[PDB]
Symmetry: D3
Subunit: 312 residues, 6 copies
Amino acid sequence: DIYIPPEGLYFRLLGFASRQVIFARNSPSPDVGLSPVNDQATDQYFSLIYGTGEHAGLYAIKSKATGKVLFSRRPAEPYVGQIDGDGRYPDNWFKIEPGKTYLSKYFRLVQPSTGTALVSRTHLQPYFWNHPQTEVFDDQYFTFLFEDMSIDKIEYDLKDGRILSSTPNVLATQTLENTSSQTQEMSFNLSQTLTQTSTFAYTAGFTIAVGTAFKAGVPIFAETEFKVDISVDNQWNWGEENTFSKTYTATFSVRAGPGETVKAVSTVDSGIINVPFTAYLSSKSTGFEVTTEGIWRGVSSWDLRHTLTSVT
Amino acid sequence: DIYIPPEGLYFRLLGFASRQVIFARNSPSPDVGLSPVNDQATDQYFSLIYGTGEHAGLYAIKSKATGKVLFSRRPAEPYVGQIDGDGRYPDNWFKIEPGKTYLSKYFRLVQPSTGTALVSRTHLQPYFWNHPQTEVFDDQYFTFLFEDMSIDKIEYDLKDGRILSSTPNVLATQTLENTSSQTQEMSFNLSQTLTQTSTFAYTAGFTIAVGTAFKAGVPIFAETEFKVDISVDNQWNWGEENTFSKTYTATFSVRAGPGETVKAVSTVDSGIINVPFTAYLSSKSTGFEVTTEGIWRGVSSWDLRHTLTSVT
Amino acid sequence: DIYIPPEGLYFRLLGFASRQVIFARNSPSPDVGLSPVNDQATDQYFSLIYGTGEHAGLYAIKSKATGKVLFSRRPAEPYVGQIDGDGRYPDNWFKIEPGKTYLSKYFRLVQPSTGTALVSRTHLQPYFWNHPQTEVFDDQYFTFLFEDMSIDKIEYDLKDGRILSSTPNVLATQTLENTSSQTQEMSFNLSQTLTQTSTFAYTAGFTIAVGTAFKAGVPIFAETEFKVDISVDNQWNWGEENTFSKTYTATFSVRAGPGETVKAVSTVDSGIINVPFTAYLSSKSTGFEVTTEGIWRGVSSWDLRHTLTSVT
Amino acid sequence: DIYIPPEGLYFRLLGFASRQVIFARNSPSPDVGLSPVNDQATDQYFSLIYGTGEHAGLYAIKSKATGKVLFSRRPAEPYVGQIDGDGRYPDNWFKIEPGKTYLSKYFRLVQPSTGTALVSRTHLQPYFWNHPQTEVFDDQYFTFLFEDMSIDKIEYDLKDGRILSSTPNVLATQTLENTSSQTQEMSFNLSQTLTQTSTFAYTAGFTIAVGTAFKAGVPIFAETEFKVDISVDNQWNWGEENTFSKTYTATFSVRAGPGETVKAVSTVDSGIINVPFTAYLSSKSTGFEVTTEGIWRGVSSWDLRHTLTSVT
Amino acid sequence: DIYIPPEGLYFRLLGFASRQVIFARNSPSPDVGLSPVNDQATDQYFSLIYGTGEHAGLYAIKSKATGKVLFSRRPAEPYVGQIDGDGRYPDNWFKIEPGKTYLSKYFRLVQPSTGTALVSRTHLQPYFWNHPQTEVFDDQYFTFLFEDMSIDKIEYDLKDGRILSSTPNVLATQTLENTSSQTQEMSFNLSQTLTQTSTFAYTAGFTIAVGTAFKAGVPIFAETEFKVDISVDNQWNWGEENTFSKTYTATFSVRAGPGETVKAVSTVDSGIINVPFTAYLSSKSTGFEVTTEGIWRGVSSWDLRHTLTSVT
Amino acid sequence: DIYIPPEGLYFRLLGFASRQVIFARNSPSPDVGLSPVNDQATDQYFSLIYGTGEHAGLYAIKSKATGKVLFSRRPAEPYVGQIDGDGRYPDNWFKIEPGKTYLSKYFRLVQPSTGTALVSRTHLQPYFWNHPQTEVFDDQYFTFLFEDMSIDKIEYDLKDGRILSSTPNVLATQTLENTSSQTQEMSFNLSQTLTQTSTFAYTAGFTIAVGTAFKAGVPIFAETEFKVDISVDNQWNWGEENTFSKTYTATFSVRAGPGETVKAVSTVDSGIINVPFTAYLSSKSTGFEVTTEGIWRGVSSWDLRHTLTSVT
Ligand SMILES: OC[C@H]1O[C@@H](O[C@H]2[C@H](O)[C@@H](O)[C@@H](O)O[C@@H]2CO)[C@H](O)[C@@H](O)[C@H]1O
Ligand SMILES: OC[C@H]1O[C@@H](O[C@H]2[C@H](O)[C@@H](O)[C@@H](O)O[C@@H]2CO)[C@H](O)[C@@H](O)[C@H]1O
Ligand SMILES: OC[C@H]1O[C@@H](O[C@H]2[C@H](O)[C@@H](O)[C@@H](O)O[C@@H]2CO)[C@H](O)[C@@H](O)[C@H]1O
Ligand SMILES: OC[C@H]1O[C@@H](O[C@H]2[C@H](O)[C@@H](O)[C@@H](O)O[C@@H]2CO)[C@H](O)[C@@H](O)[C@H]1O
Ligand SMILES: OC[C@H]1O[C@@H](O[C@H]2[C@H](O)[C@@H](O)[C@@H](O)O[C@@H]2CO)[C@H](O)[C@@H](O)[C@H]1O
Ligand SMILES: OC[C@H]1O[C@@H](O[C@H]2[C@H](O)[C@@H](O)[C@@H](O)O[C@@H]2CO)[C@H](O)[C@@H](O)[C@H]1O
């Protein structure tokens, strides 16, 4: 079940085959066609108008540059183009038809009343065109390349945290020092660094572009509960594994007995952990809000422990 | 070691560079060339004929539409095309030469006796052509895009199941109720939902297209054994991680002692688990059978436990 | 360090050798001597008067029947007997000298100013007499046989309880019943009996006679704490091991899932346990109070547990 | 932070949009342009010259075939091409500007003093050209396709090994044999095979091409330490999960008691494990050295155990 | 609740005070009195006749030597003696009145209709006599010294066995031998001896004399069950702690791998254990049967274990 | 198997029945008889002369006061007495015949060639006499009351130590203190006292009198080994349970992290423990040496542990 944008949200239509994007302008001379992506060209941005009535479940595609709406039709030339009136004509309404396999993030834009499918290709002219819908070719598939969106907030569902694995890792055994009897002080220092892991995986909602850079706190098991470690300021990449460092730091002293040599074993539970979350985004142009649901996953550490003994 | 189809199995030849597929028809006028993929165009489907004798280890490429066989040759024009006789001529026999790195699912189709390599490109004409085999370019590489195949059956090798991790997850501690002494009944309810995981990973045999939708039971650890949970009816995607829900349900009652307050702790072992399997497929056009070996992998839960105590 | 009674507390003086008790009456004719024990003969009861001044650390022995006080002297006949005035004369003051080995609950009654030791024997006349203190014979040793004392109260020091051993004992595994699927009710019953143990061991204070019958609550480990089980009404014997029965009783039901056979494992921690205590006693004749400190020890059971599972 | 090659290291410049590579030759007639990749064409190889002085942080791009250096300029025709003098002119210096999202392994090659960006496209002529830098299109992005590099050595950092999970897997319980009493010999055999896993993941340094085939020892937990298993001779693929087999082999005998039936339980700890490492590479043409840092990850087994008991 | 013998069972009546035994003969001249114990003198043996009717709950004391029955009476001289007719006269019936404290294994023999108590003393004549029952002296107390009884059988209640403690004791770690690689044989020997413990404690039934020598099997925990170790042939002493030796013996071999040094750890669970039992006895003179219930207690060992590993 | 003294070791012969001791002097007038025990009267001390030749396995009883040797004979008056010549006559040789049950620490002194048994009684004259050996009475039994012996040394067999039980006892949980963040010092104090236990039980060798006071170190489990705690200076009593106190003392500090509240859990393993030993004694009069083997037993504590954590 593919994510279709609501009405206030802008996007590009990237063709599978052409690897190029639809434009709609007023001038210059060819008013619609294909172009290499330019993020700053308003030309290439479109939003949808949700059909109602008999058009419920269909969509018109409104140019942001121009305000006009796309059309696909067979007899009258040209077969595709732009036009006023927010879907006045039956030519402006489109069924979104998701593909399968390697086309499962792609979809057709079929206009049913004319039995016509939008076409995006570089091998043949015109590059942006249509085709009889019954004959399905790969160059009829499109994907959404959404407008740049800022990740305002990550809110974890900590109650539903989960430990998927757990093994003790001894950070520093050694740290054992002596002068048999009375004395008074033996001070101990702990500085050990573990490479932890972090992945923000899509689950539902808005499709954040893979690779998107952002910052956030990352989950942590305390002793009986999950919490957010706000200290960790690494740049994450949406949907990819990142690594970060966690340094464990402690100082503690001992000696006060008859005649003993102190040992200090500093130990941690490490293992895989995961936590659901919801991200909150907004359009950088507009302020328009969406959310994304996700599961966060990471190799982590918890329950720092220092154990003190004696020998003779 | 790449998977080469046996004789009854159909496929497209997608070019690395052209991102387009070979066709062979009788009419219209140019009888072989390149086209965007159309699953329903018989045109684009081919099977192999396994060379024997001096041609052992080589292959002819028979058009499904036409019945003719591909050829590559140097002096006589045109250099490539179609012809009768199931590899009558030495021009019809091809060595399949797998690439490396980003071309490791791709291969060349070299015809040795002419020292010639098949070419698939969009930058230069003719698009489908050949080239002297000693000069290796990226546009000589092809991959198999097999015909649509139905996944008839998944059969797990349960004896070889494996737990890769295990930690206790307490589903519901709380569930503790009281009225000090005699009474009679304290009933308890359990409804807790864990997000489980599922991945069907290729290992050997037929190369199922990544993303392929299907349904099956998914493995489970019982107490001393692996078994299949037939309840779970989610749509899987071959070679990708999917998530599903497992709800744990129980009702149990207690009180019958001197003077105690009952507690009920409902607990599960969760962790990663994996199980080999063999899938059985068949051509949707023909009925032709293959198998695929795979390892299934998943975050799961097992050994549901309820523990009852007392307090004063 | 032997227990010497305070001034309000009555006792008999049993001789090691004679196995007979001192009497002091007014009539009949021989006013002091030895007799077989008769609990009701006031004759045989004595209390001490604690020397002060130069007599500090010494004791006079006052007859309860008569009110007079014992004397031991050498030149004047008779060497032992009775007399008025609560230790008026130096002849009435005695050093209590504990024995060793088999005489460590026994002691001499030496009157230092005359250098004379009290004698209790059946082999030679007079049976109750004295002897030069420097020549030590076994028939100069005496022990206290205290008046009958009622055990009014046992107060345990529960904070200082201790588990000396712990092993799980499965009371009833079996208790597993089935009718594969839906149904609704599977009820389970638990009745299992463990032979527990109980010993009230002297530690300090008043020397309760070994074998003394009484009743009390007996300690128990709850989950995080020691408590007194008031239910257990067995007759104990001071300083001896007793056995008692503890029956564990529970009823609980289950079934509510897809298709499972329920198992129920009822289990306990058993092991040795011990708890300090103070007993409070009083004279049955008089009301005079003392205490005894002790450690209580017992094989016991704790943490009753019922664990419910499933099979197919 | 993208990996930029030092001066002795050769590469191709693959365009995002064109999916074609820059060439620079002396003859034939068009001396620079785009071509499909040919690994053996010196034509397509370039190294960088690190700007210094006012050009510090910028780079010239020297042709390996020709020795000349690339230029981008606006007024004078042609806008791009080749020229003598290792960056004599300001036209030869380039800022490398990494992309984001799907372009994060790609970068622009902007020549600042002319305000001009290099262009690689197939939709419009000339295919290799430039464009005003302020108007950013997708066809200005390039990635490095480095020269073939041999993996000479893998050196693990064994002290920093880590167990991320651990569960016991019983390989063979059964293996229990009998003839009640005296006899003498009961011999036992163990042959059990576990499918292990191996992944060499990039972390820092030189960007080894994903899929690169090589051989190496793979880490192992001994009892108190990580070590390299040199036995395992599988072909690995850089940055991808591979599987391999580990067979556990043992023979041991028993019987010598009063009257017992022997049992033998052969058991292993399995679980996920990971270990940092540094790889050492060198150019196949030149011998030029680089390194790559990585974390190795794998499902593994450790601590083989045989436990012998008795029955009657 | 003291053990009173049934009618076919013989005994001596030992006085607390006299430490001497009642006799009844025909000749010589004084026909009843006291004597030092002689096991072979029929003289000193008596059985009881259980009163019925109005004499229910009372007992006559029949001489084994003579067949006559004891009497106690006040007015007529002599006050005690012997007479024909198995309790014809009211003078022959006795209430058995258990003492307390140090007299709790002792009892009075009071003849109620005359209000008279039997007397056993050495300090005054006649030594065997009676006294007005209302005046209670210590020399009226008697205990049973039963006839010699053979212990024919011990039958344990194994289902009700119990582990009161359990800790692992490593018998022999060391036992580790090497010659790095191929070889073939490494044989291992185990001979380790633990001092075990054994106590047969009275619980109910016939009062076996403390110290009684006998032989029997002694309990043992197997793996899931208690069993009798028939091997152990030590002489036990009823009601006392005995020690015995248990030697653990095993031989096992190993080597068959790539390149490893074998270690062998031989280990046992030791701890306290106890088991109810019933003993079966019979008179050595007569064959007359009784039983005794008891709890057996012992420090023991169980679950012998050998664990084999590897090093490099 | 009773302990019979070697030739240099002195003793008294205490009669079971008489509870009196044999004397042999030169004057006054009756030269042998019975007397109440006087430790300082040389009169009452005897050693044995081990028969050889035909007298092997028999013993003469030499008076320490007099140097003469005991005799028992029938026809000639008096039947018992004293005489010169260290067993010149057959009248001076005695078989030691251990009793059973309550007489198992007692024995007869039978002189076989006259068929005569030594007699010790208070009920009949002469008190010290003999009797025809075939008629066995209780007043023919004797026990050894050895001369006062000093306990010079206890040497434990530490390698053969054993833990019979083990449970963790938390001494002080609480000890948790806070001031959220930076600060620097949180110091912790531990003072907790456990009542331990100690019993020196006879096993073999010289029969140390029960109750004998002495001092020694007492065993202790360290971490991997038994050792002697020389600190513990309580007075022990041979063959009886004693109690002593063990105080555990420690001081340790902590804080040095981001923002945590420290907790400190001080814990010990407690449980029963036992260790074989050999004691070395010597005569206080003479210096004559013996040994005693024994098992020492005690409730003890070991492995002191302090565990430090964190909270927010
Ligand atoms: O899916 C689009 C296909 O277009 C086909 O081209 C058409 C052309 O657009 C139209 O004008 C027509 O009259 O002739 C052609 C054939 O119907 C291509 O053949 C095909 O490759 C697809 O791109
Ligand atoms: O790998 C195929 C290469 O083809 C080359 O083009 C050839 C052309 O096909 C042929 O007719 C010849 O005579 O001239 C060209 C050069 O040999 C391309 O140059 C190359 O880019 C590859 O596509
Ligand atoms: O410890 C008492 C001892 O008494 C001794 O008897 C005395 C007797 O009492 C006294 O009158 C004296 O003059 O003669 C005896 C000897 O001194 C016993 O000899 C001794 O057995 C103890 O009982
Ligand atoms: O990023 C490169 C873009 O080039 C544009 O084409 C230019 C052309 O190269 C130049 O000669 C100019 O004078 O006219 C065109 C428009 O400025 C394309 O329009 C664009 O698609 C990009 O490829
Ligand atoms: O419990 C027996 C007591 O007997 C008392 O002696 C009696 C004696 O037997 C009787 O003949 C009587 O007439 O005179 C004595 C006093 O009543 C003892 O006095 C007492 O010691 C007990 O043994
Ligand atoms: O075991 C000793 C027994 O002695 C018996 O007394 C003897 C006495 O010693 C002796 O002189 C003899 O002639 O007459 C008595 C009977 O044989 C006692 O009868 C007995 O009680 C035991 O003490």
